Amino acid sequence: PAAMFIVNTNVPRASVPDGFLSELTQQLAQATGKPPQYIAVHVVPDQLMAFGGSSEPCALCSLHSIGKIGGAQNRSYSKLLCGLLAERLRISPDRVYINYYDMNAANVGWNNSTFA
Amino acid sequence: PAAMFIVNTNVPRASVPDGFLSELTQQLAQATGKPPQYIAVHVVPDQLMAFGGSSEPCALCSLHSIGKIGGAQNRSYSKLLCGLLAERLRISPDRVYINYYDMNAANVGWNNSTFA
Amino acid sequence: PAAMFIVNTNVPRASVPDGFLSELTQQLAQATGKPPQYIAVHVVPDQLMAFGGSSEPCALCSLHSIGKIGGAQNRSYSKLLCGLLAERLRISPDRVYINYYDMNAANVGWNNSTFA
Numbered sequence A, B, C: 001p002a003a004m005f006i007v008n009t010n011v012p013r014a015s016v017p018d019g020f021l022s023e024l025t026q027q028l029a030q031a032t033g034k035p036p037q038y039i040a041v042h043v044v045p046d047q048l049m050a051f052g053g054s055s056e057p058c059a060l061c062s063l064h065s066i067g068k069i070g071g072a073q074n075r076s077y078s079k080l081l082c083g084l085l086a087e088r089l090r091i092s093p094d095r096v097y098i099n100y101y102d103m104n105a106a107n108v109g110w111n112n113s114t115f116a
């Protein structure tokens, strides 16, 4: 039942608020319905990035999840996650892409095995 | 109609030209037929990498796009992108991998929603 | 026949042993049956990450391969790779995810073309 969220951004590290990784863990566990134990978060600041040819603040993100991915769900995750990047990192939501991936359990390794 | 291009390389940051992300943005806009506003670019230098067991300059890259991905198009993008990586980052084209992803609009978040 | 392996971890760079990239290359070549010349490896230490909300050592990894991906094969790769991360980076196997991707040859660029 794993899920993992990565955010890559040109915002500097010092502008990522204390607790951001915990907030992402908590809110993604609520949004996906998964226990927080199985949510992993990876935040990558200070990146060399451009969005539409502008180097103003932006983010490129991915959510990989075993299940809980689909049309309506992804719209709800995007409202949640773009809102968090706007409020916490001051990145405009129209300068964020988030790619969503529904992983088959047999294609996710954990603890010397897979979830298949 | 988003697209995005990521380059991970062991070439040092000082060797990535200041104009490289703009050059990639413009050349990918032309190659995909998309307005440059829709293209995001991310360059990640100074990485700990090996390609075929050697740590000479190399790159591992990804192009994710809503449409404009397919057998013939991907052959053409590989020539474009190997040319840019060879000239601007001094990477031999046989030390470049590019993974191509045709993303469904429902699986790309932007601006608080998805493109579906 | 390309394959590539990426490990992202919060373990510090100084904790990644000399020879780790070579060990990954050789062990993956053996595991996948591919010649090492086709294997790329990418290790990303010092990352800002959490797994289950905790920032104890963890890793998020990916193996992309043209073929040699499947249920039993991925279980075997997970035992190998978690074992290497435990022995070499001191990361607990229950704090590792590895995502496996079977890439179509037409979607992997190399040297001015694709593998199709």
Ligand SMILES: CC(C)c1nn2ccccc2c1C(=O)[C@@H](C)N
Residues within 6 Å of the ligand: B052, B094, C001, C002, C037, C038, C039, C110
């Ligand atoms: C030069 C040769 C040994 C060679 N190096 N190499 C590195 C990565 C991926 C493929 C290849 C390859 C090939 O034989 C082509 C035809 N697949």
Ligand SMILES: [Cl-]
Residues within 6 Å of the ligand: A001, A033, A034, A066, A067, A068
């Ligand atoms: Cl679930």
Ligand SMILES: [Cl-]
Residues within 6 Å of the ligand: A017, A018, A019, A020, A021, A022
């Ligand atoms: Cl934090």
Ligand SMILES: [Cl-]
Residues within 6 Å of the ligand: A102, A103, A104, A107
């Ligand atoms: Cl999958």
Ligand SMILES: [Cl-]
Residues within 6 Å of the ligand: B001, B002, B066, B105, B115, B116
């Ligand atoms: Cl679209």
Ligand SMILES: [Cl-]
Residues within 6 Å of the ligand: B052, B053, B054, C021, C022, C023, C025, C026, C036
């Ligand atoms: Cl080697």
Ligand SMILES: [Cl-]
Residues within 6 Å of the ligand: B053, B054, B055, B056
């Ligand atoms: Cl070398």
Ligand SMILES: [Cl-]
Residues within 6 Å of the ligand: B102, B103, B104, B107
């Ligand atoms: Cl998709």
Ligand SMILES: [Cl-]
Residues within 6 Å of the ligand: C035, C036, C037, C038
């Ligand atoms: Cl070889």
Ligand SMILES: [Cl-]
Residues within 6 Å of the ligand: C069, C070, C071, C072, C073, C074
């Ligand atoms: Cl199998």
Ligand SMILES: [Cl-]
Residues within 6 Å of the ligand: A112, C082, C083, C086, C093
């Ligand atoms: Cl182990």
Ligand SMILES: [Cl-]
Residues within 6 Å of the ligand: C102, C103, C104, C107
């Ligand atoms: Cl594919």
